[PDB]
Task: structure prediction
Amino acid sequence: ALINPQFPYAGPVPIPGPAPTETMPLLNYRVEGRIAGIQQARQFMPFLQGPHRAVAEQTYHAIGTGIQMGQTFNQPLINTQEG
Amino acid sequence: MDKKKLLYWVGGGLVLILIWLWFRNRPAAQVASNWEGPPYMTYNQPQAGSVTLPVA
Result:
């Protein structure tokens, strides 16, 4: 702010002001609020809580069976070298 | 005999103990199957190479 003498800035907005209204009042709000609809315990989703496999491992079962059977052919006898 | 009174009487026990152990070891093997070929279907049986013999 600058004040300049001799033209000085009025020393106030004075008493000639026009009170325009008495509408100043905010009427307090008084209220009762009830949000009470029956609630049912459940919601349907496509899927909740699953941690789906991105790849599975290979998996398997097992079997064996049979017996011990055989047809054989042997090497001929040979002269013994030494000993 | 000149036998001291010390270690050697311990030594006699040790000798006896060693001999008993050896005999048990010698006799302690079960009369059994330890020679192997425990595959009951083994009438052919040739584990190495061709041309073999059973008595000189």
